[PDB]
Structures are given as C-alpha cells and as structure tokens.
Amino acid sequence: GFGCNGPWQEDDLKCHNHCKSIKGYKGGYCAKGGFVCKCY
Numbered sequence: 001g002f003g004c005n006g007p008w009q010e011d012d013l014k015c016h017n018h019c020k021s022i023k024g025y026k027g028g029y030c031a032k033g034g035f036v037c038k039c040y
Contacts, residue, residue: 002028002037010034 003014010030019028019039031038 001035004030004034004037006034008034015039 002018003009003011010033012029015028015030015037017028018037019025022039025039028037028039030036
C-alpha cells in the first residue's frame with residue numbers, strides 16, 4: 001500500500017514519502033509492482 005498500492009496507481013513518491021516519515025529512512029520505492037513499499 002502506502003500510496004503506491006499496486007500497478008493501477010503506483011505513486012513512487014508516495015512510497016518515498018512514507019519512508020520519509022520513518023526513523024532514518026532515506027527514500028522508498030515499490031518493490032513488487034506497486035504493491036509493497038520498500039524503504040532504504
């Protein structure tokens with residue numbers, strides 16, 4: 001989820017922004033077709 005949600009929508013920046021709100025995560029990207037929002 002987290003704004004990306006899946007292929008239909010897939011807002012990468014939403015995923016990015018989600019991770020921005022987490023401790024010290026730099027950014028975020030949809031790992032498996034929008035579904036999962038992975039952070040680094």
